[PDB]
RNA sequence: AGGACCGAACCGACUAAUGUUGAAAAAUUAGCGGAUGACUUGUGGCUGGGGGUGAAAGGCCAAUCAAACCGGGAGAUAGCU
RNA sequence: GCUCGCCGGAAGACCAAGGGUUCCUGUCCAACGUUAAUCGGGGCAGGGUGAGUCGACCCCUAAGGCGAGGCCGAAAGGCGUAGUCGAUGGGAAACAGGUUAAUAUUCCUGUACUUGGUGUUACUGCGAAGGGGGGACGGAGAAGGCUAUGUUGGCCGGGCGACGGUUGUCCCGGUUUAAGCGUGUAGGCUGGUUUUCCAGGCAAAUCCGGAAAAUCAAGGCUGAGGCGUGAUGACGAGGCACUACGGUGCUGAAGCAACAAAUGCCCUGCUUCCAGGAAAAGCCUCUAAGCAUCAGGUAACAUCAAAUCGUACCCCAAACCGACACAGGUGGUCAGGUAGAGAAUACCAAGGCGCUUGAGAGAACUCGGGUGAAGGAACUAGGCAAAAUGGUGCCGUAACUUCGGGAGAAGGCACGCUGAUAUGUAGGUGAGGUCCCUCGCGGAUGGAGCUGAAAUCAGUCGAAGAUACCAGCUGGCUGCAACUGUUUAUUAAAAACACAGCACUGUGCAAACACGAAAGUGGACGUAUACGGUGUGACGCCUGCCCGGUGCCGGAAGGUUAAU
């Protein structure tokens, strides 16, 4: 059928990108939770 | 006027291929491998100043580097820039 | 008029149009249109606040002369146009100095009449003049209720108020809903019944005409579930509980007036 | 070289009931 | 002219057979309904969990919905196995 | 390499999204390929994407997002004005031909075009965060002109046939050419030109709008296609050749006409309907500020620039989404031949492939199918499934009915090929030629040539003429629901939901009501012929009795009654 991931990099970067995480208030705690976790890529962008 | 150390920093190599040799003989275009953040006017000024050769127009593209697997760990080769500098009508530059 | 559509099709069997040759086929006046984005029934929070709104044909909000500011200039009606927003037709009206406007169309108006606002005006339908100088017992529309705001009472298709009294500095209106109401007497009003008085004599014929007007389908209460409405659930058809709005307030016969500030302008309630 | 293409078997997804039940 | 007619694109999903540890965590084949409209679809936006949205089935909200998922309270509790 | 098969509105071509070197060469076959493999979309090394004109970047905005101040909020923050972002839309400009193993509207050849600076010549009212015009807009339909494109003839070149005949009314192949520039046609739209004035477009006006007056009823705007020109060129079937059999260079004729014709163009047009059909900048124009012949503007003319990024490849898939090289899913553009109404359907061309396990043997049994004696629903929960009916033209058609319907009711007839009417008819198209001609892409008789139904009569063939593929089963009684629609993605598509219509009720606009502590916003840029809520569910006939119960509405005289 039509599966549940139709990829589009505009919507991907616009909803899960670094600036769209950095804009809000519990988005900056998302990025500060991955830096303390020490991940490779923080977000998609 | 462009910075002389900048024009000395831009040109990195020539290019060595079958397309490069045929473009050197049939169209008088030298093929260079230039810096990553070069531009057309800076490359034209540098190729007129360093080699001292009259140059018509310059054609640049960005080669995408491959992704190799040395050993067992994957790795990215470094992208760069390639430039087809043509020369004037009837003018030799090796 | 009313032209019963000949029943060549089911759904066309019941339609009744309101045809009128006077409504100007053609273009509107470009300095007076706007953009009017369809709401969807959705406020700034994003939710559906009011329901059954969404879809329909795209409209362009005409700008109208609801305030009748240009006094003292005799203003001939250029043409009669079909406003999609409101119920009544509008009349593009050309003034003497040459600045056209849009006025909500009175009853017996046609392209050729003189409509003059102000205080000096004579008493013919269209001539806006204040209720200090309107003869009592008359009928008016486009009535302001605070002096200099824009008409707010009786501006539908064919509605009209009556000026039953004047004493002190208050006029007493019998509105279209049968309620009498004080209004301060410096407010302007416009003489005459309003135009499209066959607008109630239409029927929509089919559900597609409701969807063109821009209403969604309304799902009544007793065919829902008890999470989704008070009357929901029930094996079979069961409606044992008292009739209530979807947020728990009785509909059939419960007064819900709240503003105590304008209870002083209620001479008589509606009946 | 030595690729060693043996990743672990993550196989079980879900199930359902879908059976004629004695009741 | 029409929420008109018969019918391909396109949307569906009514019947049968085949598969059902399959080719496929809902499909193929042969027929079937709508097919100028309350149609369908591309692209971007919006509504967030007792909340959304609902032509209303307790349906849908990332193969999960009589109240999602991820972390935390948390080694909840369990007269039960 | 030779055959054979399959798709051919795709299983062909070009893309966007998406992926990210899979593209091409050389080498290896450990692993991967549902097998072998010298093969590969696998490993390894090397190569490969060239843009003033294509697209992003840019200028302009939509739904919307962030939103200096501000309002609001225990804190976090919510909303929102100036603004500033946001395309799927608006905005300048390039086509043809050739080459690479790999790019090409990017490279090369030919011919172009656009916007800006600078400077030189001539001339003088220039200037906006403003005013105005325009940009700038629906659905359906209908006709006309065309084009893409095909068919037929001619012309040029090749051929005289492995088997009867084949110098002909024969067979095969070609018969290509653009953008730009001029010419301004088929057409559509608009009355113009000039003078004076104005309660108007926040002031400003010569611009727009509005009035009055003179003159001419033809000036302007828009516009597919044609004809030149580009072109004397390129392209071209082919020959001539040097060999690494892979190739490679020079030459190279004809290169017209008629007809048919699109969903594409004129068309962002015209007719018509109501459900009344984006915004801002480009762009044209008026001026206030001011700047004062300084600057600037505009007709040229030369000269410089046009940056950066994507340009490989797949792109209905073996490379995206589905764990897989998975019979699944995925939006745009191009749409040839023969029958056909058709983009269905059958066979085909260009093109691309034969679905990454094969060889046997021809048991049960299972799947997809074909036919069947005699009977025809006896099968069965139930005509489920199959079988039949199918087309075009004509004849004909009932009960009932809301006058439309029923209805394609049912039911029946004709259907091929050949000859005649007519050596190809009616009709369509119109070359000549002749006359005017406000002289040109002008108009009338003129009908050559080209194409071309359809019908009647006769003959004849077959068992069967819509011969294949595609292509209604029909009728009678009745329940339920007025109908078209929508739903339980993935066991339920209905008698359920909606629906137009009916009624009750709330609401006088700072509405009722909802979302939000609150601002606010939806309601609504609407105003009782409107809006919310509730029940019912077209249309016809109708809606009868009860206010004891529980609600709701009206009373505030009395009993009981809180903080204070
Ligand atoms: Mg991740
Ligand atoms: Mg480039
Ligand atoms: Mg409602
Ligand atoms: Mg209703
Ligand atoms: Mg309903
Ligand atoms: Mg229910
Ligand atoms: Mg409840
Ligand atoms: Mg019951
Ligand atoms: Mg009971
Ligand atoms: Mg239909
Ligand atoms: Mg099917
Ligand atoms: Mg149909
Ligand atoms: Mg919850
Ligand atoms: Mg239930
Ligand atoms: Mg789910
Ligand atoms: Mg719970
Ligand atoms: Mg435990
Ligand atoms: Mg605890
Ligand atoms: Mg075939
Ligand atoms: Mg393809
Ligand atoms: Mg690789
Ligand atoms: Mg390859
Ligand atoms: Mg290879
Ligand atoms: Mg081996
Ligand atoms: Mg193998
Ligand atoms: Mg490889
Ligand atoms: Mg362009
Ligand atoms: Mg912008
Ligand atoms: Mg904004
Ligand atoms: Mg904000
Ligand atoms: Mg602040
Ligand atoms: Mg766009
Ligand atoms: Mg654009
Ligand atoms: Mg290629
Ligand atoms: Mg170039
Ligand atoms: Mg403007
Ligand atoms: Mg249209
Ligand atoms: Mg043609
Ligand atoms: Mg021929
Ligand atoms: Mg022979
Ligand atoms: Mg012979
Ligand atoms: Mg041309
Ligand atoms: Mg490409
Ligand atoms: Mg395969
Ligand atoms: Mg596949
Ligand atoms: Mg075809
Ligand atoms: Mg087909
Ligand atoms: Mg067998
Ligand atoms: Mg059979
Ligand atoms: Mg038998
Ligand atoms: Mg037999
Ligand atoms: Mg028999
Ligand atoms: Mg029987
Ligand atoms: Mg029986
Ligand atoms: Mg039996
Ligand atoms: Mg059947
Ligand atoms: Mg059958
Ligand atoms: Mg019964
Ligand atoms: Mg029904
Ligand atoms: Mg239906
Ligand atoms: Mg639906
Ligand atoms: Mg279901
Ligand atoms: Mg569905
Ligand atoms: Mg079903
Ligand atoms: Mg409000
Ligand atoms: Mg009901
Ligand atoms: Mg009923
Ligand atoms: Mg009753
Ligand atoms: Mg009672
Ligand atoms: Mg009582
Ligand atoms: Mg009673
Ligand atoms: Mg009471």
Curated annotation (Swiss-Prot), chain A:
Part of the 50S ribosomal subunit. This is Large ribosomal subunit protein bL34. PANTHER family: LARGE RIBOSOMAL SUBUNIT PROTEIN BL34M, MITOCHONDRIAL RIBOSOMAL PROTEIN 34 FAMILY MEMBER. The keyword Ribonucleoprotein applies. GO terms for biological process: cytoplasmic translation. One of its GO terms (cellular component) is cytosolic large ribosomal subunit. InterPro entries: Ribosomal_bL34, Ribosomal_bL34_CS. NCBIfam families: rpmH_bact (TIGR01030). Transmembrane segments: none annotated.
Curated annotation (Swiss-Prot), chain B:
Keywords: Ribonucleoprotein, Ribosomal protein, RNA-binding, rRNA-binding. PROSITE patterns: RIBOSOMAL_L23. It comes from the Bacteria. GO terms for cellular component: cytoplasm; cytosolic large ribosomal subunit. InterPro entries: Nucleotide-bd_a/b_plait_sf, Ribosomal_uL23-like, Ribosomal_uL23/eL15/eS24_sf, Ribosomal_uL23_CS. One of its GO terms (molecular function) is rRNA binding. GO terms for biological process: cytoplasmic translation; ribosomal large subunit assembly. PANTHER family: 60S RIBOSOMAL PROTEIN L23A. HAMAP family: Ribosomal_uL23_B (MF_01369_B). One of the early assembly proteins, it binds 23S rRNA; is essential for growth. One of the proteins that surround the polypeptide exit tunnel on the outside of the subunit. Acts as the docking site for trigger factor for Ffh binding to the ribosome (SRP54) and to nascent polypeptide chains. Belongs to the universal ribosomal protein uL23 family. Part of the 50S ribosomal subunit. Contacts protein L29 and trigger factor. Might also contact SecE and probably does contact SecG and SecY when the SecYEG translocation complex is docked with the ribosome. This is Large ribosomal subunit protein uL23. It comes from Escherichia coli (strain K12). The gene is rplW.
From Swiss-Prot, chain C:
The keyword RNA-binding applies. GO terms for molecular function: RNA binding; rRNA binding; structural constituent of ribosome; transferase activity; zinc ion binding. This protein can be partially replaced in vivo by its H.marismortui (HmaL2) or human (L8, from the 60S cytoplasmic ribosome) homolog. Residues 27-52, 220-271 are annotated as: Disordered. Part of the 50S ribosomal subunit. Forms a bridge to the 30S subunit in the 70S ribosome, contacting the 16S rRNA. Interacts weakly with S6 in one of the 3.5 A resolved structures. In pull-down experiments interacts with CedA. Belongs to the universal ribosomal protein uL2 family. This is Large ribosomal subunit protein uL2. InterPro entries: NA-bd_OB-fold, Rib_uL2_dom2, Ribosomal_uL2, Ribosomal_uL2_bac/org-type, Ribosomal_uL2_C, Ribosomal_uL2_CS, Ribosomal_uL2_dom3, Ribosomal_uL2_RNA-bd_dom. One of its GO terms (biological process) is cytoplasmic translation. One of the primary rRNA binding proteins. Located near the base of the L1 stalk, it is probably also mobile. Required for association of the 30S and 50S subunits to form the 70S ribosome, for tRNA binding and peptide bond formation. It has been suggested to have peptidyltransferase activity; this is highly controversial. Residues 38-47 have a biased composition (Low complexity). Changing residue 229 to Q: Loss of peptidyltransferase activity in reconstituted ribosomes. No change in rRNA binding or assembly into ribosomes. The modification N6-acetyllysine is found at residue 241. Keywords: Acetylation, Ribonucleoprotein, Ribosomal protein, RNA-binding, rRNA-binding. One of its GO terms (cellular component) is cytoplasm.
